[PDB]
């Protein structure tokens, strides 16, 4: 019987074999369904391919359905062929092909479907539109999952219109012809576009109609390789948030938002020719994690200069725990911007393109208040002499109203004799750094003790300083005099800061005591000094000697030729000193370049406190002993205060080179112009 | 041989539809298999549907297994049919039918299935249980992958269960009644409640019994169009995690949190009849990223006041990244609260149901710590006349601490008179904003520099002034008598601030000279003066005048007549002058209410630089020059202090409206009772 | 006709069983196709199990095609058999079981496939290693679907090996040994490991070779059960993305990380045998919104103390929104690191496996801004007596340079008489608090009004204090003289701050009148009065008598005996008063233990306005009037200052015990050392 024939026959287990298919849509569109629901398998989309099949389900009345190449399929008679598909459409069952196929259609068929994308793979792409609430896209990963817009396609590889809001684009990779590392761009290209919105409607949110309520969350996607920007938000949108979204290897700006109220959080932009951000017309939004690095990256060609993040004409904006990092040029360009509130913000090493010539940041025309502040420059740390910036921060314009506070000199040793802020330019802003009171601008009564003068002869003899100290004359410093200040105070356990503008005289070998505390070296001398020795070649050093604690420590270093003082410049050179923790400054008030050195921890063999056991008084231009060596020069602006770390040095160095440190701390400080 | 007929018919391109199905999961409880792990072809769940068919696969012996009408089909017989189905559920299985369908007990069996549920489409529900760690509800968008709570149910559409931990509720919309703009609701309905917890397992994260850690996240999850909540988070919940919440639509309150130990991202709350946020009995919780916006909307229908955030009886919130605004009300109380600390935080153009009424923040018995704040009131920028704010920060008690530091008054031009702070009620609290010292509370000793008085009589007469200034005579101003007070101090490129107490006589046409630097009023003249001019109509000016950097400028603007200073009445008026930057400030003692103008950047012709040349003089009530206009009325507590800007201006009147402006910057302050 | 037959036979609704099909992968490689793209049904990947099967189709020419046991199954002819499978695997495809059984191959196999993985279930593994782009991991929850480390397998649960870039986890757990609350661990287990990278590529993102990029994302992933490290980043690798981790339940350290160049969000990590938290070694991260609870969790079993977090030789860190709480031994450690910046820091109630043992942060040769900092102790304020922290600060190192700012003592009642800080140890590192100027450490001068002495011998006695009050002799204060000091000046509405050393005679019964605010008590009497009562059996009482406002209060409240004041012991005794506002606070100056009580709220019954009517004037040791009483011992160091919290009281301490509280705030500071 034929019967148990065709039983066995379908019952082996190679028995689907028997039961035919649809060897793609274009067939189906001929296959008239007989009966409602009828289960068609399609082998594949497109002849050939093995790819795109599945199960369709037929409706014999296809009214009120259209063909869309992919899940409706229609027939000559009329019926619907329905894909048998719960939930997300994929490219592949509109047709894509993968590989290296233009499959711009069939993604766009997706994003029209009606339903949310999935993306299983990498599709080349020209253009494509989001233009629906249901165009959200999904992939499993920023790279294999992606979209890659052909070398020959320009403009957006992804546009996001007026119509789409409340869509999720999430974990998959937005790639352009530069997506790999040191390679080239195709010219005009954006990676995510989002348009200015053309209109309001007033059914959110089942809204087919333009409105400016985007409402959407772009989360864990990955935008490498475009030209003009990986990411574009126009002016007009609202609520575009980004999330854990990663911009690589961008020709010119990473990111540029150009609107109102949004929050992105976690964002990093890497590698950039220009920006890796833009803010330009923004108001009221919200970054809070962010990682800007590799701005202006030369080998992207752009000459000319581009910050790490241009903030412009701007207002309200709270940028919280972002870093600005080895950028080309400036680390941030704020710039007729209101109201830049900024809380955690670390920039350091930026400049890379030029040594010593562009700034962290740099004010023009705005207002910002910046909490936690750090910058610890890693190539000065280190040493490596790699391009790194000038300094932290530039004014541009004295109108701007800035609040700075945090580490804006972080204390590391300076094996080069720098760290982060190796060029000062002081500014008459409205500018608060560290909360320190600008000397400039108080009327706070202070303590002012006043000095013995000492001398092989006792009268002070005085002479002319360059204009850049502010004053006519100062006090005559001479070795053959011994010219010195003797205070009677004494440094305590608190700590001490000294400062002086000092106008050396440099001709042959000698040894400058700019100034002591205590006097003597060795195991109990109690004492302080700073040095500049020369020697008879004309080499420079600046040592500083401890000596308490049981032992004594020289702390020295040769300054390289560039870096040596010059005979008849003023500098302003400060040492703090207390127990474990001591720094020294030399600063050039007529370029405003600094050196400097500071020692704590294992560069000290002890903390040297009987230093400041209430016994060794303090010392200007020689030290407390009759035979000690002096100076050759001239002296002014003589300031004692109580202890500031380098950092407030620092910052109050951008108010004026060689004003007093801390008005509020302030113990004395001398003119010196024909007085003592 | 009818072989052949049937292996070519079967080979039809349509053969598949020869393999015949189960009509519906009923007909498939009365179809036995009668092999194991049998292969079975579900047309569809329910008849007439084509909706939740599958591939089923038999076990003859259904024991330990039970029917859940979707994926788990038992028989008469007693074999289990299991739907071949790896990964997640969706709500068609069990049943659904989508479009206006109750679809409650199929989204409930989906939840309750043991599978994480996903959301293909939108589904109507009345109330839904989330039960279990297996209860994760995935969609894939905000709008249209959603539930939707049918328009007679009340209660909470979503209620997670003190069992149910762990879980997450990822891309999806909750929608109730009021989901689409401007439309009604439901009475008494929310969209998700976390449910107090009844007790504490000793098995996590395995319990099956009560417990107070959810541990679970809700994110990128779109809530809209519920009456008493949004999202409500009962007291004894730890970790509900939110990212990017958005909650839309709400007739009362937004989100509502009582429960401790909790962080959430990047929320944003819009459009609420009553506060975006309620905090009531918080503790040790985060936010980080926060917009609410919309709050007591009153077309919702609430009358009575409700503010943006409520922060009530709460402590330890650190609340970073937030902005409140366009709210009809306040925008933050903050009540019985202690150690609440914001860092960014952005209040501005809030009070839109009644103009000058409400304030920005409002404290009542609580401490908080704020910093980088902002608040750029962009209606009192643009003019618009909009309703808005009355100023920043208002203090219902006087046992507050608070600390508060950023951009107090924003420092726009103010086209309208007007700006951020237009109302200022000074507070006792115990309240340090900018870090400026309050003078009531200082014993430091300063700078007083003595005037000296000049009139055409150069004796000084005393006259009456009202209480509210704080002393019995100030001293008597005539343009008869020119009387005036000469500082020898010039102005330099620091700046400068100048304030007094006037009581102006105000009857006909006259010039009031309130202060100036320098005199005269030409290319070269270095001067500046602030007047009030009053035409013989009684219209009032207020006007700049500068001189200087070889030009002249006139920044005068004419007062609407609600903005005219009132004759007998006291206002402190201040200035602050430097290069590129002037802005003047007239405030009423008695009422509060401020008018003021700031003038940087292209509202200046020039900066002005030799204004500050340290060759112009400053004076009170006329200038340097013997002809100049006077000022009638009275004159009292003058200020001279360096440069402040607006911002620490404004901050230092919520200490006191006539004090002076910053200790640390003052140079003289005359009290003038009856002396200079 | 058997062909009716047939077709009626397939037709039946469970006709699908007469299609044969593969019974299992095995019997599929035995299977050679004669078509190509040849449909074939696989019943189940291993025999026996229903688990793995789907619908595979045929390549007869299986060349460049690779057997992998799940989704491309060869044959001995040369086919390969491709499983129909658009997007991503599951293990149950590759032959997992689920169960008990040993998943690990199939896991792997998944993961090394080219597809990222769904996890549908909970598999158990020993070993996992993520090595491709393509190895990204998703679940449906943090419980459910996981990794389950088996008991015997040690290491690492989850490699993410340095070939590894661009992937996401998402929504998953990774459970060892001890995952359920209270069990034990495997040695040597980790949850999840991050090697340090080989080497660098220059193709990224298209790399095949190690590369330090790893760029990507660990989202809603929980970790719970390891012994060495929940999550371990180890040096070298950059931009590990975390977002929503939670970490439970690990012997030693919850999360290390050792690199550079990061951001994590919303991270959670509880209970820890050692840390939740190290960073060692990092730099140029970001943590933003972070919960690290009941690390050095005692039943753990590690003896000896660990902090909830390490932050060792790291720089550069922005650390926003965080929180330390319940951890068993001290806060945060900070030890040899550069510019740690924390914006919103919440530290309370750790130290709690020993009472007044440890604390909230513990600064070691580190620099530090810490900003919005709060720490109210739960368990004092609730009175509990849980062990808690000792305090908030402690400085192991006096080179520290460290910025603090915010409630640093929350001002809650003290039922117990103790607060935040109840043990301050001084520093003279270099160190700010809530911006108060250091008295130690200023030259600012200031008011310093003189009392007059009054007894009833006018003539002040002097005699010895204890060294550590750091002056020789102090006032000797009696009953029976009634030594006192009179200020004239009177309370004003801004509140008042007073303060002395006080050494007490303590011997029978007897009333101290510390300090006062005018005299008398009763309805009207406008007056405080701080005392300390003995009673004839030596029970001690601290009460604050307010009069005014029409009635009269005793807040007091009788000492334990372990909190008594002992004879010959200085106290720095302090009180804060103000309209609804007053704290008393009595330091052991030579342990640091402090007792405390403050008054706001409904502690009072009125706000006792009156009291600060510029009527009542303050007097030390006694009040105002002539029969009042007074003291016995000696006092010293007498200071007046305007109002302070007890916020900057505490925050001053930490200068020094017994300085001026507040030198902006000075009114008058008296050493008494043999004058008035
Ligand atoms: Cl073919
Ligand atoms: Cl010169
Ligand atoms: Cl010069
Ligand atoms: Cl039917
Ligand atoms: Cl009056
Ligand atoms: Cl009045
Ligand atoms: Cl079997
Ligand atoms: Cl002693
Ligand atoms: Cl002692
Ligand atoms: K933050
Ligand atoms: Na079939």
Same mark, same amino acid.
């Given at each position: 019987?034929? *019967?148990?024939?065709?039983?066995?026959?379908?019952?082996?287990?190679?028995?689907?074999?028997?039961?035919?298919?649809?060897?793609?849509? @274009?067939?189906?569109?001929?296959?008239?369904? +007989?009966?409602?629901?009828?289960?068609?398998?399609?082998?594949?989309?497109?002849?050939?391919?093995?790819?795109?099949?599945?199960?369709?389900?037929?409706?014999?009345?296809?009214?009120?359905?259209?063909?869309?190449?992919?899940?409706?399929?229609?027939?000559?008679?009329?019926?619907?062929?329905?894909? /048998?598909?719960?939930?997300?459409?994929?490219?592949?069952?509109?047709?894509?092909?993968?590989?290296?196929?233009?499959?711009?259609?069939?993604?766009?068929?997706?994003?029209?479907?009606?339903?949310?994308?999935?993306?299983?793979?990498?599709?080349?792409?020209?253009?494509?539109?989001?233009?629906?609430?249901?165009?959200?896209?999904?992939?499993?990963?920023?790279?294999?999952?992606?979209?890659?817009?052909?070398?020959?396609?320009?403009?957006?590889?992804?546009?996001?219109?007026?119509?789409?809001?409340?869509?999720?684009?999430?974990?998959?990779?937005?790639?352009?012809?530069?997506?790999?590392?040191?390679?080239?761009?195709?010219?005009? &290209? &954006?990676?995510?576009?989002?348009?200015?919105?053309?209109?309001?409607?007033?059914?959110?949110?089942?809204?087919? +109609?333009?409105?400016?309520?985007?409402?959407?969350?772009?989360?864990?996607?990955?935008?490498?390789?475009?030209?003009?920007?990986?990411? %574009?938000? !126009?002016?007009?949108?609202?609520? /575009?948030? &980004?999330?854990?979204?990663?911009?690589?290897?961008?020709?010119?700006?990473?990111?540029?938002?150009?609107?109102? !109220?949004?929050?992105?959080?976690?964002?990093?932009? %890497?590698?950039?020719?220009?920006?890796?951000?833009?803010?330009?017309?923004?108001?009221?939004?919200?970054?809070?994690?962010?990682?800007?690095?590799?701005?202006?990256?030369?080998?992207?060609?752009? /000459?000319?200069?581009?910050?790490?993040? &241009?903030?412009?004409?701007?207002?309200?904006?709270?940028?919280?725990?972002?870093? $600005?990092?080895?950028?080309?040029?400036?680390?941030?360009?704020?710039?007729?911007?209101?109201?830049?509130?900024?809380?955690?913000?670390?920039?350091?090493? %930026?400049?890379?393109?030029?040594? =010593?010539?562009?700034?962290?940041?740099?004010?023009?025309?705005?207002?910002?208040?910046?909490?936690?502040?750090?910058?610890?420059?890693?190539?000065?740390?280190?040493?490596?002499?790699? =391009?790194?910036?000038?300094?932290?921060?530039?004014?541009?314009?004295?109108?701007?109203?800035?609040?700075?506070?945090?580490?804006?000199?972080?204390?590391?040793?300076?094996?080069?004799?720098?760290?982060?802020?190796?060029?000062?330019?002081?500014?008459?802003?409205?500018?608060?750094?560290?909360?320190?009171?600008?000397?400039?601008?108080?009327?706070? #009564?202070?303590?002012?003790?006043?000095?013995? *003068?000492?001398?092989?002869?006792?009268?002070?003899?005085?002479?002319?300083?360059?204009?850049?100290?502010?004053?006519?004359?100062?006090?005559?410093?001479?070795?053959?005099?011994?010219?010195?200040?003797?205070?009677?105070?004494?440094?305590?356990?608190?700590?001490?800061?000294?400062?002086? $503008?000092?106008?050396?005289?440099?001709?042959?070998?000698?040894?400058?005591? *700019?100034?002591?505390?205590?006097?003597?070296?060795?195991?109990?001398?109690?004492?302080?000094?700073?040095?500049?020795?020369?020697?008879?070649?004309?080499? #420079?050093?600046?040592?500083?000697?401890?000596?308490?604690?049981? +032992?004594?420590?020289?702390?020295?270093?040769?300054?390289?030729?560039?870096?040596?003082?010059?005979?008849?410049?003023?500098?302003?050179?400060?040492?703090?000193?207390?127990?474990?923790?001591?720094?020294?400054?030399?600063?050039?008030?007529?370029?405003?370049?600094?050196?400097?050195?500071?020692?704590?921890?294992?560069?000290?063999?002890?903390?040297?406190?009987?230093?400041?056991?209430?016994?060794?008084?303090?010392?200007?231009?020689?030290?407390? =002993?009759?035979?000690?060596?002096?100076?050759?020069?001239?002296?002014?602006? /003589?300031?004692?205060?109580?202890?500031?770390?380098?950092?407030?040095?620092? @910052?109050?160095?951008?108010?004026?080179?060689?004003?007093?440190?801390?008005?509020?701390?302030?113990?004395?400080?001398?003119?010196? !112009?024909?007085?003592?």
């Amino acid at each position: 019987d034929s *019967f148990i024939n065709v039983i066995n026959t379908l019952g082996r287990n190679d028995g689907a074999k028997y039961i035919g298919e649809c060897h793609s849509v @274009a067939d189906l569109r001929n296959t008239e369904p +007989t009966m409602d629901g009828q289960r068609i398998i399609l082998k594949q989309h497109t002849a050939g391919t093995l790819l795109g099949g599945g199960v369709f389900r037929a409706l014999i009345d296809g009214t009120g359905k259209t063909d869309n190449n992919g899940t409706v399929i229609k027939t000559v008679g009329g019926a619907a062929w329905l894909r /048998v598909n719960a939930d997300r459409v994929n490219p592949f069952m509109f047709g894509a092909l993968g590989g290296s196929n233009d499959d711009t259609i069939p993604v766009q068929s997706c994003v029209d479907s009606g339903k949310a994308t999935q993306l299983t793979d990498a599709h080349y792409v020209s253009n494509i539109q989001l233009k629906y609430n249901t165009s959200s896209i999904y992939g499993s990963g920023l790279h294999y999952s992606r979209l890659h817009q052909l070398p020959s396609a320009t403009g957006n590889c992804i546009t996001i219109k007026d119509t789409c809001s409340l869509i999720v684009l999430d974990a998959f990779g937005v790639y352009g012809t530069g997506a790999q590392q040191g390679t080239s761009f195709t010219a005009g &290209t &954006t990676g995510i576009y989002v348009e200015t919105p053309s209109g309001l409607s007033a059914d959110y949110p089942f809204h087919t +109609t333009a409105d400016p309520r985007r409402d959407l969350c772009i989360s864990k996607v990955h935008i490498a390789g475009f030209d003009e920007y990986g990411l %574009n938000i !126009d002016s007009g949108n609202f609520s /575009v948030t &980004t999330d854990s979204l990663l911009v690589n290897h961008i020709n010119q700006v990473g990111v540029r938002c150009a609107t109102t !109220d949004w929050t992105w959080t976690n964002i990093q932009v %890497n590698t950039c020719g220009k920006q890796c951000l833009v803010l330009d017309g923004c108001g009221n939004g919200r970054i809070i994690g962010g990682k800007f690095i590799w701005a202006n990256w030369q080998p992207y060609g752009t /000459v000319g200069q581009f910050p790490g993040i &241009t903030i412009n004409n701007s207002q309200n904006m709270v940028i919280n725990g972002i870093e $600005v990092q080895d950028c080309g040029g400036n680390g941030i360009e704020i710039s007729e911007s209101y109201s830049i509130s900024m809380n955690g913000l670390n920039t350091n090493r %930026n400049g890379i393109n030029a040594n =010593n010539t562009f700034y962290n940041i740099v004010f023009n025309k705005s207002d910002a208040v910046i909490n936690g502040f750090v910058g610890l420059n890693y190539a000065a740390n280190s040493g490596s002499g790699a =391009n790194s910036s000038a300094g932290n921060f530039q004014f541009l314009s004295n109108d701007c109203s800035v609040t700075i506070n945090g580490v804006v000199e972080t204390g590391y040793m300076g094996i080069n004799f720098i760290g982060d802020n190796n060029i000062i330019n002081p500014t008459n802003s409205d500018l608060s750094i560290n909360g320190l009171v600008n000397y400039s601008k108080t009327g706070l #009564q202070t303590m002012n003790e006043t000095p013995t *003068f000492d001398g092989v002869s006792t009268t002070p003899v005085y002479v002319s300083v360059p204009s850049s100290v502010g004053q006519v004359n100062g006090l005559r410093l001479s070795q053959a005099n011994k010219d010195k200040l003797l205070y009677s105070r004494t440094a305590g356990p608190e700590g001490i800061t000294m400062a002086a $503008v000092i106008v050396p005289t440099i001709s042959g070998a000698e040894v400058f005591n *700019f100034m002591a505390i205590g006097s003597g070296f060795s195991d109990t001398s109690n004492s302080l000094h700073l040095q500049l020795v020369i020697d008879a070649s004309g080499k #420079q050093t600046i040592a500083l000697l401890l000596g308490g604690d049981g +032992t004594t420590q020289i702390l020295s270093g040769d300054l390289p030729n560039d870096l040596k003082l010059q005979s008849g410049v003023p500098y302003h050179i400060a040492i703090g000193a207390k127990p474990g923790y001591f720094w020294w400054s030399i600063l050039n008030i007529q370029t405003g370049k600094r050196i400097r050195r500071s020692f704590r921890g294992a560069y000290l063999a002890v903390p040297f406190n009987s230093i400041f056991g209430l016994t060794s008084s303090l010392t200007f231009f020689s030290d407390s =002993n009759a035979g000690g060596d002096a100076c050759s020069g001239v002296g002014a602006k /003589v300031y004692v205060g109580m202890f500031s770390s380098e950092n407030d040095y620092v @910052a109050s160095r951008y108010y004026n080179l060689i004003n007093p440190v801390d008005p509020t701390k302030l113990i004395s400080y001398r003119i010196l !112009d024909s007085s003592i």
